[PDB]
């Protein structure tokens, strides 16, 4: 199927408690493979998945250098952003960047991504053309003009279409036994009486990878969108994910309800009912 490589940068100022912490994590789809933390006793890009461990010293040294430079650049960016919003030196602020590329089943580039946020709100983003910017406000227009003058977008296009995709394809091959393996959900329906006239039906999906899944309830073949309680898909800690969907049903009407499951790992979509 399709795949992505994404890096997630978070820098957080903490006035009075030293300089802003910088964290970078890298993912291939839902699998983290590297981390860097400027607050670690000895900051270094570290492996977080077994398949990346084979990379040689140059990979670890170069990514550590990029991260150490980023720790400093993001602090300069936070100082600039504070001024662009006329903010006091007393408050804490956050700068985030997420960037990377997507490829299809043939390994060809689908699109690149580069987006940034300040205090959790969209600030500036590279457009899908990898050539122009979208700035959220007059502060981001200052960044945009600065990056336009230095032709940053052309540099980002070259990275996203070159290095980005070359390394995503390399990771997909080195980790193919996991990264290109879809594990289907293990499913079951539970029944929990609430009162004499209603019960909860809960549809479970466990042990699946990747996280994308469709889990719905139907009543007489009609989707129960508004009436379904659907928890966020959550990590189990063994690379897999979990999710459930529940509906409150009238006593005796359980057989009118069907749970539908769609996932890449399944040979066919599932239709489940409560089995007393």
């Amino acid at each position: 199927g399709s795949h992505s490589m994404r890096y997630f940068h978070t820098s957080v100022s903490r006035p009075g408690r030293g300089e802003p912490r910088f964290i970078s994590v890298g993912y291939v789809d839902g699998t983290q493979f590297v981390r860097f933390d400027s607050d670690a006793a000895s900051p270094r890009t570290e492996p977080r998945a077994p398949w990346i461990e084979q990379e040689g010293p140059e990979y670890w040294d170069r990514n550590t250098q990029i991260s150490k430079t980023n720790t400093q650049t993001y602090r300069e960016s936070l100082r600039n952003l504070r001024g662009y919003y006329n903010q006091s030196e007393a408050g804490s602020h956050t700068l985030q960047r997420m960037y990377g590329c997507d490829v299809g089943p043939d390994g060809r580039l689908l699109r690149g991504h580069d987006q940034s946020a300040y205090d959790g709100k969209d600030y500036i983003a590279l457009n899908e053309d990898l050539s122009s910017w979208t700035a959220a406000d007059t502060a981001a227009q200052i960044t945009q003009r600065k990056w336009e003058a230095a032709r940053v977008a052309e540099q980002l296009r070259a990275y996203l279409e070159g290095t980005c995709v070359e390394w995503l394809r390399r990771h997909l091959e080195n980790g193919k036994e996991t990264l290109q393996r879809a594990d289907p959900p293990k499913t079951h329906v539970t029944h929990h009486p609430i009162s004499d006239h209603e019960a909860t039906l809960r549809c479970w999906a466990l042990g699946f990878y990747p996280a994308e899944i469709t889990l719905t309830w139907q009543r007489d073949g009609e989707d129960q969108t508004q009436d379904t309680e659907l928890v966020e898909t959550r990590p189990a800690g063994d690379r897999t994910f979990q999710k459930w969907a529940a509906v409150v049903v009238p006593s005796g009407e359980e057989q009118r309800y069907t749970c539908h499951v769609q996932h890449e790992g399944l040979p066919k979509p599932l239709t489940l009912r409560w089995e007393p």
């Binding site: 170069r62 952003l81 960044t143 980005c164 390394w167």
Partner: peptide
């Protein structure tokens, strides 16, 4: 490899 942007915001 990661990208490297040396120019601040």
């Amino acid at each position: 490899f990661e990208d490297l942007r040396v120019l601040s915001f």
